[PDB]
Amino acid sequence: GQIKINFDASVSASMYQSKMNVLNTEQYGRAMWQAYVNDGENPNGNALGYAYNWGYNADGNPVLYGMTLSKYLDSKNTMPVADTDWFDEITRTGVIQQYNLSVSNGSEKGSSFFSLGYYKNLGVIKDTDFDRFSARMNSDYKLIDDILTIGQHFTLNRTSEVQAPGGIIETALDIPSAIPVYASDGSWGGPVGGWPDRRNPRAVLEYNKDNRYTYWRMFGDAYVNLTPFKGFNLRSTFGLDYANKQARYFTYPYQEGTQTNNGKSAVEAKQEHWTKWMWNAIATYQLEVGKHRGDVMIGMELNREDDSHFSGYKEDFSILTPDYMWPDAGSGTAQAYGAGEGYSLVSFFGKMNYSYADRYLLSLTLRRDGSSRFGKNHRYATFPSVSLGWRITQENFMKELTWLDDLKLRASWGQTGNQEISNLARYTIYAPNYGTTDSFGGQSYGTAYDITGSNGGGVLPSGFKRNQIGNDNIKWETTTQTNVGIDFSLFKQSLYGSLEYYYKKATDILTEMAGVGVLGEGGSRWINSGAMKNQGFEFNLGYRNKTAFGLTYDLNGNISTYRNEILELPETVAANGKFGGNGVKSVVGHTYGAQVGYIADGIFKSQDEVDNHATQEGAAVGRIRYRDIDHNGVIDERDQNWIYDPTPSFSYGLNIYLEYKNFDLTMFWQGVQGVDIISDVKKKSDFWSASNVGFLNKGTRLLNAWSPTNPNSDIPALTRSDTNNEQRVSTYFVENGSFLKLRNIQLGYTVPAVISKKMRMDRLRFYCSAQNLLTIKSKNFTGEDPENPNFSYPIPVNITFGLNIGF
Amino acid sequence: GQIKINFDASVSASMYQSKMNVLNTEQYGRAMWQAYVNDGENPNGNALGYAYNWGYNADGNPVLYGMTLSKYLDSKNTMPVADTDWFDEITRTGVIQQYNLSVSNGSEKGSSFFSLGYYKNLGVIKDTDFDRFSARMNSDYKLIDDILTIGQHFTLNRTSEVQAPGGIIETALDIPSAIPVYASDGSWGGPVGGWPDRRNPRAVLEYNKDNRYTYWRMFGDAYVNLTPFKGFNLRSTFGLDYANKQARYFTYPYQEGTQTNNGKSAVEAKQEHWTKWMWNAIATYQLEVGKHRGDVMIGMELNREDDSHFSGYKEDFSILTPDYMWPDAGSGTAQAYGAGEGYSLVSFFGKMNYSYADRYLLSLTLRRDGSSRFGKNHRYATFPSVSLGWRITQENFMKELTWLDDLKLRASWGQTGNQEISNLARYTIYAPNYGTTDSFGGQSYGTAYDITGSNGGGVLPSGFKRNQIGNDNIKWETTTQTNVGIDFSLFKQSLYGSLEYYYKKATDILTEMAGVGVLGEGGSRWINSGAMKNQGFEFNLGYRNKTAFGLTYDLNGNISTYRNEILELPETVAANGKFGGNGVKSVVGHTYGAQVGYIADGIFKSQDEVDNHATQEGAAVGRIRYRDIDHNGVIDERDQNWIYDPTPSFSYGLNIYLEYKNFDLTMFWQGVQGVDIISDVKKKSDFWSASNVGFLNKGTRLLNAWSPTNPNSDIPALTRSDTNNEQRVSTYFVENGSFLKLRNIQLGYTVPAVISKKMRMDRLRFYCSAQNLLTIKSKNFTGEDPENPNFSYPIPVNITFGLNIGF
Ligand SMILES: [Mg+2]
């Protein structure tokens, strides 16, 4: 009948634009010397030396005059000295290209659709990539001209990626720049001696580059819709969603500096399989009697997911290439892994819809849902909802205004469930875990022991081990929610918007609860722990017009606000600070995620302020001074109060569309103001010893720590050990996370239809676009991303060129 | 738009209706007894007991008077004696159901298609099933009216089977009927003591019943067709065909009489992937200048297949249920398995077509194919073809004969490549087989030894084992086929048919040739071994008509005939047998498969026959007597001649269609005439001792084998040892397999269009059918399936009810 064709294509370059700055290899020594002399041991007896000619100023203080490092890091000259930018070393400009062609055909009789597309992505991490092919094929048929439709949706995907390893950027930022990339032969460089037991990340990436998965996913449905007469039709649909991931991971042997493997080669070939199917059947009747309108609907839907996975492991390979490293060619020992899980949900439902004329509307809904995840004392759970509005501008007493285009007054109340918890929540789980599986520094937890004292060479006797305690009285998390709002439109639909207010109250919150310590192994269980309150207001306001000199504009902002309150909690649960006041104060009556901690009042600027302040264990000159809230003249542990609050003062957003002379400009600003933010990145940027591993690289800012020669710095001095417990929960780690993000900007040129039609087109538009271009942040923030405080690096900046084609 | 709906359904009961009859537990004793007295030893010393009270018949010939066994076959009363119809026990009435719905809308802008089929098979072996779901969803789209159409094809399968284990039936037939299905406590029956080392089939079917694979395959293409002006269109098309098998195989402990697993539990988690993709481009121009008509096409096509598989095996499970037995839950030791293979083909090709207005016709074709399978020196081969035809009834001198409607004279000469060999056929392959895989009676060939003498307890040294020697000059198998034929039609399209003659010449036949013994391990290689020849005539003759009384009838006749001969082999190959000749005579000049053996002129009825005969190492009274082809007085290894040739004298086939008064009866007959077939079932049916396993259970026609109390019988006497070498290659095992078979027969009733239209149908038909319902034997044949001589059972007889609906 009518055939539509749409083509789209993009390229997008993608760049990290900022990161936590870390020590130069030059400054890494300045930082150490300063730490050593602050603590009064000879700076020249360091394990990494780094030889200094320092001394004192006529003032008694120490002064650094100069540094020398001896070309190689060892007395054998295997590892030359470098000044590596480990971030720039494992980082690329990312590049994205994608195209998509889609074509639809709608006769009346039926209508089909077809779609191909491709996306490819050079990661911003080196030796990483990702690609995806999609095909979509949808269609329907009218078997009996207004009585039997039959139809199908289908989508087919194939993905292939080499993923970046578990936090490598994090591991690039704390590998001192003194380490080189390459050793002196040309090997992969790496630590030597007492430098930190961190492996070369550029090398990690290479050793990873052949670990690629391949993922296929089929998902769609078929449906019949039968209309037995007038305004009543029934219809079932059936759907599946099958996915499949296969990959091989390679262990290759490495011996870079002190990082050895000693000579381990292995292969793991793993398989994963997810199979979800679903089936509903739905009948609807609707009427229409002059000033009377009604919908009623009734139906049910089954779901069922069964997923499952397994794996084959073999060590020792005579050729170190992915062509040879298949389990068949392995010589050494082997392991086999795999399990599976699943659940099924069943749901029955109905909806009521009624309207008088077009002024007063009413709607009721009722569902009963049941979940595999529960007993059967609590399998099912019924949820009701009622909502009703009043189109006021249809009241005839209103009418006279006439500029007031529309005005409703909505009010809803309903309940909804949550059973999104582990598939084996209710069970006491005992695993036979024999210990066939990697760990770190021990913690097999393996239940297999050489009882005979033979030292092994054989199969040991195995056991069972508890993974979880059950909860055979575990029930749904019901959430009760109550909305009321006012929709408005004005001046010939040029000023549109809304104002609503919500109150959400959740009951029998589902969480997984770490068990008390003396309970021992697998003390965690899934429990319901009480209630939480959430409520606030929303505002939407759009203004779309078009000035005399031909400039279409459409603005549409949003502003929000909400207060959160933890209501009840089991004493144990309030005691152990999970919701959660750090175990020093309960949270009931405060906010989900509120934290109690010590409060840091700058630092001690001479020996007098230390005596003129409570007996503080490790209080010295230059250390952090924590106020006393005892007001008993000692610090101890009762000292603290509430110091962190996650809830923002309000969050806002504003979307800008413009069109002028075929040019086409759009923006989207989001932001939040007045928000507390707590983070650990300072522990790596303000201290030389606020970590558990020695001599890792540190942030750039502790270069400006307090010292004799440099005071009135907020930042404590530099020591070789955390004697003052600086890494206790304090306000040192709470900063201001107010910001204003420019999510997206996109400028477009659309070629005039008068001549885009000359080439058998219709729409022909080019555009340029950026994502996360810029953020506007508080002065009080140490750095990086305010809405991801925990990360030492920001999000990557995209910049895109692209076109659309119309036909 | 024109919408067509199609529904087809079928149910279908499957039944065995014959099998080789084996011994009653009553007879088994009679057969053992006869062999015992025959060789002259006390039949009461049987290891299976079985006590007889026999004697002599007033002629000096032994007579059986009676048998008895005990309640139990053992001095422990665990295995009671039975008369187990073992075939009947593992055999079922199979059952099939399938439906198929399909729907197709055809608009002039484009057409689409949708199909949903389901098929389920209860196998005729117990504890085996099979089911398949399919969704097809094709379509196309006219983007520019008859200039630029775009299209797709998609198909999606999901099979799930449990496959009967290899040779279950062939195990059910050599298990003695005395062994009970159940032991006397209700566990599983099995052998005990001297009875043969062979497990209860019914129990093997149980232990197999959860070894279930879940296969998913999806294949299709997308294409574009660009037709610029008229007669010239470019087409490229891309297609893929991806599939996935996964199963778990469960090994559970068993102890059944003298049949122990030693309490083994294991689980293998297999996984296979098969991925093919195909791309081509095809240009086609075609011309039509009045009398003349042309078609030239040109284009290329690349194919690539990569497949792979891997496997995780684990032992020892505290719960013997498929729900417990995942690799994770295992406790004993683990193996990991897997590898991959792949190939690619490139193909270029052109085509010519031409004629003067359906009178004289010419077509040339040329293609040049390439295969990764070969070395670079013979990657590509070129293949010409030319054919030409002459519709001679279009001639202006033949209008006289008016009965004659049509007559064409076709004639072809072509070449065609064969390339289907092992992916790695060109290579010398060295596997690093360590020995991580199952075997029977050893013969791991594991290349892993305990060089230190420690008896193991850890990971042993390993090596490499040659798997095959490579060619570095292997090449294509060409086939030069040439045909000539006559297509005719007489008496107003009522007496139709063809007669053609063909000549096929293969050159450099591609086979896998095993090495000679003294080369030992590896040895095997793929080579080209000379040429073979095939020529024949084919003939078809139909007769369609409709009598005066409303009976249409259509009789398709068909009668093949052909001869086969090898022309040229390498010296070492003609000698080693392989293609015939058994190592005793070269085949060069005889039919592929021709065999050479001793020739068996019946059996000796008295010592006069033994003595006036020729010297025959182990001749006796009752034995087979082999003739003295040599004419030298002795019977040795020079004594055989050609005794087997598999070309029939002529094959034939016949179809019968009969319409009458809305009924629709059809039949299909196939048949071969005048063939030798050679088998091996006679070793199981005619001899007590011609196997390598003890006792076993044997055919029923060793129950009229020769004895003094029963002479004039073709079947040798029973002995306890094959001292005469009866199982030498003899004509005792060649029979006549000339058969005739009713493939299919089907009665249908089509509800008259004029009433199937009043209710929306169009075609409405029911039918009942039968597959392999009967077979004509030619009584000189000992039994079962003459066109499957090597089997002990036939194909099952299918009976099927079904409907067809078209709207
Ligand atoms: Mg002889």
The torsion angle over the Cα atoms of residues A783, A785, A790 and A791, rounded to 10 degrees, is -90
Residue A531 · residue A567 · CB < 8 Å: yes
CA distance B123 to B125: 5
Distances A20 to A442, A790, B122, B746 between C-alpha atoms, Å: 33, 12, 66, 81
CA distance B181 to B80: 10
Contacts of A148 in chain B (CB under 8 A): none
What distance separates the 2 farthest-apart alpha carbons in chain B? 103
How far B238 CA lies from chain A's nearest CA (Å)?
12
Neighbours of A806 (CB within 10 A): 18
Residue A225 · residue A233 · CB < 8 Å: yes
Residue written as token pair 């983007």: B143
E strands, B16-127, in order: 51-52, 55-56, 62-63, 67-68, 94-106, 111-122
Residue B82 · residue B181 · CB < 8 Å: yes
Residue A45, Cβ density class (10 Å: 0-12 exposed, 13-18 middle, ≥19 buried): exposed
Residue written as token pair 């309030």: A574
Contacts of A334 in chain B (CB under 8 A): 334-336, 436
CA distance B261 to B255: 6
CA distance A614 to B522: 86
Cβ distance A312 to B316 less than 8 Å, yes or no, reads no
CA distance A807 to A72: 66
Nearest to A432 among B329, B339, B458 (CB): B329
* CA geometry: angle A25, A30, A33, nearest 5 deg: 125
Neighbours of A128 (CB within 10 A): 23
Residue A78 · residue A183 · CB < 8 Å: yes
Structure tokens at A746: 């996109």
Neighbours of B661 (CB within 10 A): 9
CA distance A425 to A512: 9
> Backbone phi, then psi, for A472, in 5-degree steps?
-75, 35
Residue A202 · residue A105 · CB < 8 Å: no
A611 belongs to an annotated ligand binding site:
no
CA distance B678 to B790: 8
% helix / strand / coil in chain B, to the nearest 5?
10, 45, 45
Residue A296 · residue A350 · CB < 8 Å: yes
Residue whose C-alpha is closest to residue A195's, from A212, A177, A182: A177
SS3 label, residue A681: helix
The beta-carbon contacts of A113-122 under 8 Å, at least 24 apart in sequence, are A113/A137, A113/A138, A113/A139, A114/B139, A114/B141, A114/B150, A114/B152, A116/B222, A120/A96, A121/A94, A121/A95, A121/A96, A122/A92, A122/A94, A122/A95, A122/A96
**What is the phi-psi region of residue A324: left when phi exceeds 0, alpha when psi lies from -120 to 50, beta otherwise?**
alpha
Distances B148 to A240, A756, B227 between C-alpha atoms, Å: 34, 19, 6
Residue A741 · residue A772 · CB < 8 Å: yes
Residue B431 · residue B448 · CB < 8 Å: no
% helix / strand / coil in chain A, to the nearest 5?
10, 50, 45
Give the list of residues 6+ apart from residue B455 with CB closer than 8 angstroms, or none. none
CA distance B629 to B585: 15
CA distance B25 to A726: 90
Q: What letter would DSSP give residue B615?
A: B
Q: What letter would DSSP give residue B328?
A: G
CA distance A670 to B685: 88
Residue A479: strand pairing partners: A416, A506
Rg (CA), chain A: 33
Structure tokens at B340: 């991959």
Nearest to A337 among B105, B107, B328 (CB): B328
Residue A332 · residue A315 · CB < 8 Å: yes
* CA geometry: angle A366, A372, A373, nearest 5 deg: 100
The amino acid sitting at A477 is: E
CA distance B698 to B173: 8
Residue A444 · residue A463 · CB < 8 Å: no
Q: Is the peptide bond before A580 cis (omega within 30 degrees of 0)?
A: yes
Breaks, C-N > 2.5 A, in chain A lie after none
Cβ distance B110 to A156 less than 8 Å, yes or no, reads no
Q: How far is CA A388 from the centre of its chain?
A: 37
> Backbone phi, then psi, for A683, in 5-degree steps?
-60, -25
Contacts of B139 in chain A (CB under 8 A): 105, 112, 114, 137, 139
How far A470 CA lies from chain B's nearest CA (Å)?
19
Binding residues of B for Mg(2+): 455, 628, 630, 632, 634, 636, 639
Taking chain A, what is the end-to-end CA distance rounded to the nearest angstrom? 14
Helical (H) or strand (E) element with B469 = none
Distances B502 to B363, B586, B654 between C-alpha atoms, Å: 18, 26, 22
CA distance A705 to A459: 58
What is the SS3 assignment for B698-734?
Answer: CECCCCCCCECCECCCCCCCCCCCCCCCCCCCECCCE
E strands, A420-516, in order: 429-431, 465-468, 477-490, 495-507, 510-513
Neighbours of A373 (CB within 10 A): 22
A584 belongs to an annotated ligand binding site:
no
Q: Is the peptide bond before B496 cis (omega within 30 degrees of 0)?
A: no
Residue B32 · residue B50 · CB < 8 Å: yes
Residue B554, Cβ density class (10 Å: 0-12 exposed, 13-18 middle, ≥19 buried): middle
Residue A23 · residue A695 · CB < 8 Å: no
Distances B247 to A277, A337, B162, B267, B703 between C-alpha atoms, Å: 20, 15, 10, 10, 46
How far A516 CA lies from chain B's nearest CA (Å)?
27
Contacts of A112 in chain B (CB under 8 A): 105, 110, 112, 139, 141
Residue A371 · residue A325 · CB < 8 Å: no
Contacts of B313 in chain A (CB under 8 A): 312, 336
SS3 label, residue A455: coil
Contacts of B464 in chain A (CB under 8 A): 318
Residue B500 · residue B483 · CB < 8 Å: yes
Residue whose C-alpha is closest to residue A652's, from A479, A536, A524: A536
Residue A428 · residue A469 · CB < 8 Å: yes
Residue B180 · residue B82 · CB < 8 Å: yes
Cβ distance A313 to B329 less than 8 Å, yes or no, reads no
Instruction: Pinpoint the alpha helices (H) of B239-357.
Output: none
Instruction: Pinpoint the alpha helices (H) of B244-314.
Output: none
Nearest to A216 among B242, B314, B448 (CB): B242
A8 belongs to an annotated ligand binding site:
no
Instruction: Please report the DSSP string for B406-443 in residue order.
Output: EEEEEEEEEEEEE--S-TTTTS-EEE---S-S--SSS-
Q: What letter would DSSP give residue A114?
A: E
Residue written as token pair 């103001």: A673
Residue B148 · residue B227 · CB < 8 Å: yes
Cβ distance A337 to B150 less than 8 Å, yes or no, reads no
Count H helices and E strands in chain B, helices first: 8, 39
Neighbours of A100 (CB within 10 A): 17
SS3 label, residue A170: helix
CA distance A328 to B300: 37
Q: Is the peptide bond before B50 cis (omega within 30 degrees of 0)?
A: yes
- Determine which of B102, B134, B141 to mutate to test the interface with A (most A C-beta atoms within 10 Å): B141
Count residue pairs from A and B with Cβ separation < 8 A. 198
Helical (H) or strand (E) element with B538 = strand B531-541
Nearest to B312 among A2, A273, A338 (CB): A338
Residue whose C-alpha is closest to residue A795's, from A773, A768, A769: A773
Cβ distance A336 to B330 less than 8 Å, yes or no, reads yes
Residue B217 · residue B196 · CB < 8 Å: no
**What is the phi-psi region of residue A574: left when phi exceeds 0, alpha when psi lies from -120 to 50, beta otherwise?**
alpha
Residue B530 · residue B573 · CB < 8 Å: yes
Instruction: Please report the DSSP string for A233-298 in residue order.
Output: EEEEEEEEEEEEEEEEEEE---EETTEE--S--EEEEEEEEEEEEEEEEEEEEEEE-SSEEEEEEE
- Determine which of B4, B6, B104, B107 to mutate to test the interface with A (most A C-beta atoms within 10 Å): B107
Q: How far is CA A290 from the centre of its chain?
A: 52
Structure tokens at B631: 């004419």
SS3 label, residue B209: coil
Residue B700 · residue B26 · CB < 8 Å: no
Q: How far is CA A56 from the centre of its chain?
A: 50
Q: What letter would DSSP give residue B161?
A: E
> Backbone phi, then psi, for A755, in 5-degree steps?
-125, -20
* CA geometry: angle B447, B448, B454, nearest 5 deg: 150
Contacts of A312 in chain B (CB under 8 A): 269, 310-313, 336-338
Residue B680 · residue B729 · CB < 8 Å: no
Contacts of B311 in chain A (CB under 8 A): 312, 327
CA distance B8 to B117: 9
Q: What is the resolution of this structure in A?
A: 3.1
Residue B6 · residue B101 · CB < 8 Å: yes
- Determine which of A6, A108, A337 to mutate to test the interface with B (most B C-beta atoms within 10 Å): A337
Contacts of B3 in chain A (CB under 8 A): 109-110, 141-143
Residue whose C-alpha is closest to residue B219's, from A156, A103, A271: A156
- Determine which of B5, B245, B271 to mutate to test the interface with A (most A C-beta atoms within 10 Å): B271
The torsion angle over the Cα atoms of residues A119, A124, A128 and A130, rounded to 10 degrees, is -10
How far A126 CA lies from chain B's nearest CA (Å)?
27
How far A315 CA lies from chain B's nearest CA (Å)?
10
CA distance B381 to A606: 92
Q: How far is CA A167 from the centre of its chain?
A: 13
Give the list of residues 6+ apart from residue B393 with CB closer than 8 angstroms, or none. B404, B405, B406, B407
Around ion ligand 1, residues with a beta carbon closer than 5 Å are: B 628, 630, 634-635, 639
CA distance B653 to B609: 46
CA distance A550 to A556: 20
Binding residues of B: 455, 628, 630, 632, 634, 636, 639
Structure tokens at A248: 């091989």
CA distance A479 to B676: 82
Nearest to A338 among B114, B327, B337 (CB): B327
A628 belongs to an annotated ligand binding site:
yes
Structure tokens at B211: 């070894």
CA distance A602 to A646: 23
CA distance B19 to B502: 39
Give the list of residues 6+ apart from residue B515 with CB closer than 8 angstroms, or none. B469, B522, B523, B524, B525
Structure tokens at B403: 């009965």
